[PDB]
Amino acid sequence: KSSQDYMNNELTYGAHNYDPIPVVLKRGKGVFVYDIEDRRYYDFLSAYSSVNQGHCHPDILNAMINQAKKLTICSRAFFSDSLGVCERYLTNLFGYDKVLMMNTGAEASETAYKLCRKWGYEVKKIPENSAKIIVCNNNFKCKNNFGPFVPNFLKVPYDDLEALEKELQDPNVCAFIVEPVQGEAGVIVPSDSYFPGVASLCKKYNVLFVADEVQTGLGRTGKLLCTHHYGVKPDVILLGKALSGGHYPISAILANDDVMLVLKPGEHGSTYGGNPLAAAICVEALKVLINEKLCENADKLGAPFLQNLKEQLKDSKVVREVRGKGLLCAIEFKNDLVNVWDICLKFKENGLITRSVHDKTVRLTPPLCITKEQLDECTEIIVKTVKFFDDNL
Amino acid sequence: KSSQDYMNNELTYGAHNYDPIPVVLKRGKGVFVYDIEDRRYYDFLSAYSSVNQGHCHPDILNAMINQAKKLTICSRAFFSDSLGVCERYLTNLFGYDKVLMMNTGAEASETAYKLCRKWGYEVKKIPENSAKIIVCNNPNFLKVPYDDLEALEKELQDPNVCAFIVEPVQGEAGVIVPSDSYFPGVASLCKKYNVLFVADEVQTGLGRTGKLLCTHHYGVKPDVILLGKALSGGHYPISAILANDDVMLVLKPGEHGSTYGGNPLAAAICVEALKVLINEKLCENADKLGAPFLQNLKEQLKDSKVVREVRGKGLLCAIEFKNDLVNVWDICLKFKENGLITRSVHDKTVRLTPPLCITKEQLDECTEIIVKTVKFFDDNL
Numbered sequence: 001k002s003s004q005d006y007m008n009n010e011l012t013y014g015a016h017n018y019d020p021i022p023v024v025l026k027r028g029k030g031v032f033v034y035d036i037e038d039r040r041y042y043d044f045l046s047a048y049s050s051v052n053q054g055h056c057h058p059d060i061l062n063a064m065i066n067q068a069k070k071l072t073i074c075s076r077a078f079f080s081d082s083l084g085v086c087e088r089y090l091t092n093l094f095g096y097d098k099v100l101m102m103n104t105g106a107e108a109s110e111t112a113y114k115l116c117r118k119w120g121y122e123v124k125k126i127p128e129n130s131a132k133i134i135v136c137n138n139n140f141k142c143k144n145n146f147g148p149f150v151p152n153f154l155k156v157p158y159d160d161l162e163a164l165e166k167e168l169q170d171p172n173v174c175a176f177i178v179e180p181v182q183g184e185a186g187v188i189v190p191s192d193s194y195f196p197g198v199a200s201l202c203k204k205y206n207v208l209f210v211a212d213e214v215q216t217g218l219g220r221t222g223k224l225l226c227t228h229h230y231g232v233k234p235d236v237i238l239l240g241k242a243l244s245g246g247h248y249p250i251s252a253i254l255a256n257d258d259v260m261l262v263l264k265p266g267e268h269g270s271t272y273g274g275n276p277l278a279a280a281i282c283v284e285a286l287k288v289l290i291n292e293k294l295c296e297n298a299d300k301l302g303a304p305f306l307q308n309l310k311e312q313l314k315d316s317k318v319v320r321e322v323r324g325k326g327l328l329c330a331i332e333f334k335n336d337l338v339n340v341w342d343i344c345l346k347f348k349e350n351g352l353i354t355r356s357v358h359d360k361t362v363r364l365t366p367p368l369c370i371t372k373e374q375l376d377e378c379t380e381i382i383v384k385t386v387k388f389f390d391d392n393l
Numbered sequence: 394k395s396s397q398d399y400m401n402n403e404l405t406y407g408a409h410n411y412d413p414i415p416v417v418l419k420r421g422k423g424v425f426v427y428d429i430e431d432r433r434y435y436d437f438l439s440a441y442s443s444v445n446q447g448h449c450h451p452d453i454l455n456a457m458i459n460q461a462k463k464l465t466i467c468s469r470a471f472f473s474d475s476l477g478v479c480e481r482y483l484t485n486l487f488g489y490d491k492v493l494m495m496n497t498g499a500e501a502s503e504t505a506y507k508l509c510r511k512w513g514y515e516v517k518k519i520p521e522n523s524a525k526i527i528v529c530n531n532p533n534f535l536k537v538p539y540d541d542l543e544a545l546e547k548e549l550q551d552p553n554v555c556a557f558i559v560e561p562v563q564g565e566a567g568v569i570v571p572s573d574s575y576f577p578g579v580a581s582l583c584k585k586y587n588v589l590f591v592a593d594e595v596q597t598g599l600g601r602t603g604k605l606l607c608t609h610h611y612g613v614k615p616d617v618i619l620l621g622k623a624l625s626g627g628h629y630p631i632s633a634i635l636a637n638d639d640v641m642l643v644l645k646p647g648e649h650g651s652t653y654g655g656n657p658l659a660a661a662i663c664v665e666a667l668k669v670l671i672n673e674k675l676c677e678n679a680d681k682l683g684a685p686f687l688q689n690l691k692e693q694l695k696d697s698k699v700v701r702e703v704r705g706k707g708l709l710c711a712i713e714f715k716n717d718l719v720n721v722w723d724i725c726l727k728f729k730e731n732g733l734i735t736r737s738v739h740d741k742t743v744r745l746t747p748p749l750c751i752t753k754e755q756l757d758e759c760t761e762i763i764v765k766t767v768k769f770f771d772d773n774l
């Protein structure tokens with residue numbers, strides 16, 4: 001069987017709900033993945049930050065096996081030894097009274113909305129009929145906006161304190177939920193000064209500052225929390241992805257007692273949320289992150305890589321911009337001139353796989369254990385692949 | 394550290410969003426779990442059907458380790474060898490064109506709603522922004538009584554309905570079994586009004602009632618199947634939707650986004666979990682031991698003042714109490730004391746769902762525990 005046998009097999013037995021780059025992987029180790037035909041590629045997506053520690057990290061796999069021999073799941077009908085150990089681990093490590101463990105990052109966001117709204121009722125006296133959470137324009141009037149007839153989410157521009165303050169004036173806002181750097185918007189970094197302002201603004205209007213660190217956290221930008229960079233402490237933290245080194249779906253919300261204690265019991269979530277197996281894996285995944293100093297590696301190698309790449313592409317007709325912080329980087333192209341999807345196929349050909357976002361911005365997010373030498377080899381691949389297209393206009 | 398230490402620890406570091414029975418488990422094997430103090434209990438919840446195969450089943454753990462050494466996740470940005478093998482396995486096994494893999498059962502339900510609505514437009518050609526879906530008691534949803542063909546047909550008449558989503562036996566409602574005749578009628582009715590018959594088999598499926606699909610009992614083939622829980626033997630969150638091409642192709646690329654859905658690690662675990670289910674003939678075990686256990690239990694409790702009813706099919710059973718007379722929660726604590734753990738539902742119905750590898754002898758020992766527990770509450774009234 002060949003890569004193609006597999007790709008056809010999937011098309012005929014599975015739903016067509018995804019549109020993958022045509023490579024079929026069978027193995028990962030650290031910063032490399034390997035296809036059906038034993039070709040090797042640099043993984044520059046890291047399963048969207050789930051394998052910050054690197055593919056198939058042995059320590060984590062170990063933790064997983066030690067737990068899975070004892071107990072894999074018992075459900076929230078009862079207690080496990082493992083979950084508490086995790087909860088205590090995470091809380092001490094991030095400096096929050098409590099933590100709530102879950103599976104997917106969506107579960108994290110949903111639960112966060114419930115949380116903010118209820119805190120808004122129980123504490124700030126706002127009616128759930130009328131509670132609003134501010135978010136940002138992941139991209140960029142006539143509308144009932146008053147009392148019970150309200151949007152649920154108010155969108156405002158990212159990196160915009162004036163606009164943010166304008167909405168915070170609404171007494172029915174209970175929360176601003178924001179990413180330390182916008183992933184989906186194409187890796188948009190904020191001005192150093194934004195988050196400091198955000199923290200003040202929220203403090204002042206008595207509104208929960210929630211930071212979505214599902215992509216930006218756990219080493220990706222150089223720190224355990226990207227928000228650590230701007231010296232601000234959010235009221236609520238969302239964690240996920242790299243929280244497990246790709247060995248399990250695990251995500252979390254962190255908050256102090258005054259926020260977390262708004263949550264009433266009996267309200268069902270997922271059966272697998274907070275299971276012993278995940279709890280064990282979680283602690284090891286973060287222990288690996290800290291012991292191997294992967295945060296610092298990222299911090300040290302990141303700014304250079306980005307700067308040097310900015311240099312070597314300064315004279316490209318198709319490149320629009322090169323952005324990043326730590327090892328969370330991207331290249332935005334002028335989709336007027338090039339087809340972003342082809343650039344991704346070209347990369348794949350040149351030995352580095354990644355994916356598009358907007359059909360204009362390409363994600364550059366390798367596992368955090370990458371070496372200076374490896375990054376240099378990749379800069380070569382990147383400069384070369386971009387050359388290919390520049391050489392057609 | 395003791396059970397209590399462990400519980401207090403959770404209270405102070407984790408959110409209080411659940412309300413567990415006060416037992417702290419450290420280990421599972423098959424039908425038994427063991428607490429901090431090395432006490433042993435019969436697990437009669439099976440993590441709500443996630444461990445049909447039994448706790449910590451070795452074959453599955455093996456499958457898990459073989460895969461985890463090779464690749465755990467790459468995301469849907471790319472392909473893995475393992476996923477396709479899974480997809481092909483499941484499809485052949487259940488008799489549907491395609492399958493869509495996911496993580497949680499909620500993801501399955503959400504995705505099912507999207508699917509039904511979209512089929513309802515790109516096919517039944519329902520007016521945009523108006524596709525209603527019918528569901529059973531317990532904005533574009535219509536509730537109707539369970540086990541009610543007359544009521545069901547009345548709603549099916551709405552030309553804007555695109556789907557009926559229903560459980561082969563109602564779990565949350567307190568283990569409610571339908572009359573043999575209901576589902577056959579359901580299938581006809583849906584066939585006639587041109588409406589997707591979706592079966593939620595997340596709890597009822599994979600051996601729990603004696604068959605791979607509980608609907609197999611009633612000789613009906615649903616347009617869509619939802620699977621989960623036992624789909625992994627409790628080793629990972631894995632769930633699925635099954636459907637043929639005419640329904641499934643409605644879904645187009647790039648509209649969704651859960652990173653872990655369809656990952657290679659889960660894909661591998663899935664195939665083994667079901668292989669275990671079939672090889673160890675756990676469906677049949679459940680089928681054979683089930684009806685007896687339920688009948689015999691009905692007998693031994695016929696004269697109880699606090700028991701209201703004993704229901705079940707296969708090893709999916711329950712006992713409903715008269716919450717006027719007893720506190721269901723205390724009945725659960727008493728069980729725990731007598732060596733069998735389980736949970737309440739409604740504060741009136743108690744779930745009896747052991748792992749499917751339980752033996753006739755074991756069930757008998759449990760019947761004893763159950764009867765003993767019950768008598769304690771009879772006398773004391």
